[PDB]
Amino acid sequence: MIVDFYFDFLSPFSYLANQRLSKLAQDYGLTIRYNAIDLARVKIAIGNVGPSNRDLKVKLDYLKVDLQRWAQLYGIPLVFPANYNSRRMNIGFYYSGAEAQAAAYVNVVFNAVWGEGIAPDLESLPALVSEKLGWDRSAFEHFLSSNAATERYDEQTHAAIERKVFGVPTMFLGDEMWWGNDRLFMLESAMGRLCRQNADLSS
Amino acid sequence: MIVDFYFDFLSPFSYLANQRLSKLAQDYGLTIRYNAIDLARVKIAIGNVGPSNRDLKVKLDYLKVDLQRWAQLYGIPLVFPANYNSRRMNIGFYYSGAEAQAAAYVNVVFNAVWGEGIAPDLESLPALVSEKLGWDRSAFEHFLSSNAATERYDEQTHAAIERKVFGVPTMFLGDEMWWGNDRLFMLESAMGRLCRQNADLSS
Numbered sequence: 001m002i003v004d005f006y007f008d009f010l011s012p013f014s015y016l017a018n019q020r021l022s023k024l025a026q027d028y029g030l031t032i033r034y035n036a037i038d039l040a041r042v043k044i045a046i047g048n049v050g051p052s053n054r055d056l057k058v059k060l061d062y063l064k065v066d067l068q069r070w071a072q073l074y075g076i077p078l079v080f081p082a083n084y085n086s087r088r089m090n091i092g093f094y095y096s097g098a099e100a101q102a103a104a105y106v107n108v109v110f111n112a113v114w115g116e117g118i119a120p121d122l123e124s125l126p127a128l129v130s131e132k133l134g135w136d137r138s139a140f141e142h143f144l145s146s147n148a149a150t151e152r153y154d155e156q157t158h159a160a161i162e163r164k165v166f167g168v169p170t171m172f173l174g175d176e177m178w179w180g181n182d183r184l185f186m187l188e189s190a191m192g193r194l195c196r197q198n199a200d201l202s203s
Numbered sequence: 204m205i206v207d208f209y210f211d212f213l214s215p216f217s218y219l220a221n222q223r224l225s226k227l228a229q230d231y232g233l234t235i236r237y238n239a240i241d242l243a244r245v246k247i248a249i250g251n252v253g254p255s256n257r258d259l260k261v262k263l264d265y266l267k268v269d270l271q272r273w274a275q276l277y278g279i280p281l282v283f284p285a286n287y288n289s290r291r292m293n294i295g296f297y298y299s300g301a302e303a304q305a306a307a308y309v310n311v312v313f314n315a316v317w318g319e320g321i322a323p324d325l326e327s328l329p330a331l332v333s334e335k336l337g338w339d340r341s342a343f344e345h346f347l348s349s350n351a352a353t354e355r356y357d358e359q360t361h362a363a364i365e366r367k368v369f370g371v372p373t374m375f376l377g378d379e380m381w382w383g384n385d386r387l388f389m390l391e392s393a394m395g396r397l398c399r400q401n402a403d404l405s406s
């Protein structure tokens with residue numbers, strides 16, 4: 001069973017969705033196909049050019065509370081980093097190879113940025129993450145600045161826009177798309193339905 | 204037990220929240236304090252001046268699907284009206300007297316506009332609603348155009364902005380505020396907690 005997951009490391013609601021998705025991966029062996037994309041580009045593409053929720057103090061004050069409520073439900077910390085400059089770490093995702101290492105990268109980076117509040121553009125973050133994953137620090141840093149890396153990020157962001165993705169976190173199962181950590185319960189219902197039909201419990 | 208409910212009849216997510224809230228009122232006797240307010244004014248007040256979700260085709264296409272999914276969960280129809288011109292019906296709410304008649308007005312109008320897809324500025328809607336509620340059609344129509352009616356609507360919208368309301372549907376219980384039909388599960392948790400403490404099941 002395959003779910004396509006679209007996220008940007010600047011997004012705290014993506015941090016929450018990733019935590020929940022990863023527990024489904026580990027608990028039930030669901031296969032996640034990860035896609036790091038540029039939320040700014042995706043918004044611009046659909047004409048969503050007003051002020052961002054981050055720039056609207058009254059609404060942001062409420063979202064911080066919403067985010068703590070979910071973090072408490074999930075039993076994880078949530079700490080805002082100093083900025084939302086996620087480009088480097090987004091691009092870095094494309095260094096990862098197979099599923100296990102792709103998932104490990106996404107988990108380590110999200111935990112660093114939104115679990116601990118580490119700035120996503122911290123100059124030493126690539127080395128810190130490399131040490132964690134058993135990667136070659138210099139190879140990784142060289143990849144992050146390479147033309148090929150940016151091309152790959154641009155390609156995936158474009159493929160997302162073609163798929164009618166307008167925000168993050170976004171999840172697809174078959175032809176159904178859900179946007180929001182707060183729609184994973186619908187994803188889970190769909191997954192249960194397919195598990196039942198495949199077990200011959202339902203037609 | 205009192206929940207303050209803030210809505211604008213142009214909002215389909217408010218239609219959904221109202222249906223769910225009303226069933227709590229009827230099933231468990233929860234007291235709802237209704238507040239019809241001007242979403243446009245509340246957005247302008249917090250500086251939320253970009254294009255609205257209604258004007259972003261790609262995102263609207265998804266929201267229509269999200270809205271059908273919830274309508275199916277709740278076992279109710281959801282049909283888009285031809286426009287979002289909710290001012291008259293919003294103001295009309297202030298004709299209602301006590302809780303039962305306030306709730307009946309909000310239910311009838313939401314069912315008309317978002318259950319059946321009736322334009323909220325339909326010239327005959329005030330008469331249709333009056334017939335339903337046993338009101339004096341001419342008295343109601345005269346109220347809708349009165350200076351006092353607009354004053355009362357403006358007063359409530361202003362009180363909402365003071366309370367840090369930035370959108371609809373918004374619900375308060377005590378000092379906690381939740382925004383969205385998709386946060387009523389948190390409201391319900393809070394309500395259960397208070398029912399338990401008041402029953403001496405929890406300290």
Ligand SMILES: N[C@@H](CCC(=O)N[C@@H](CS)C(=O)NCC(=O)O)C(=O)O
Nearest residue numbers: 011012013166167168169180181182
């Ligand atoms: N209700 C959501 C909200 C998710 C959300 O606000 N995502 C932002 C990025 S953190 C987004 O995609 N903004 C694009 C938009 O609002 O169209 C959830 O709980 O996850």
Ligand SMILES: N[C@@H](CCC(=O)N[C@@H](CS)C(=O)NCC(=O)O)C(=O)O
Nearest residue numbers: 214215216369370371372383384385
């Ligand atoms: N995720 C929500 C969304 C509610 C929503 O989008 N409300 C609109 C009006 S229908 C709103 O308050 N927009 C103001 C904003 O996005 O800040 C829910 O399921 O109810």
Ligand SMILES: O=C(O)C(=O)/C=C\c1ccccc1O
Nearest residue numbers: 010011012039052053054063
């Ligand atoms: O870049 C954006 O559009 C944005 O608001 C991302 C940040 C964000 C979103 C939602 C809640 C909190 C938050 O910092």
Ligand SMILES: O=C(O)C(=O)/C=C\c1ccccc1O
Nearest residue numbers: 213214215242255256257266
């Ligand atoms: O006035 C607005 O800001 C608005 O988008 C209200 C309409 C709406 C909101 C969300 C989903 C569908 C929809 O028509």
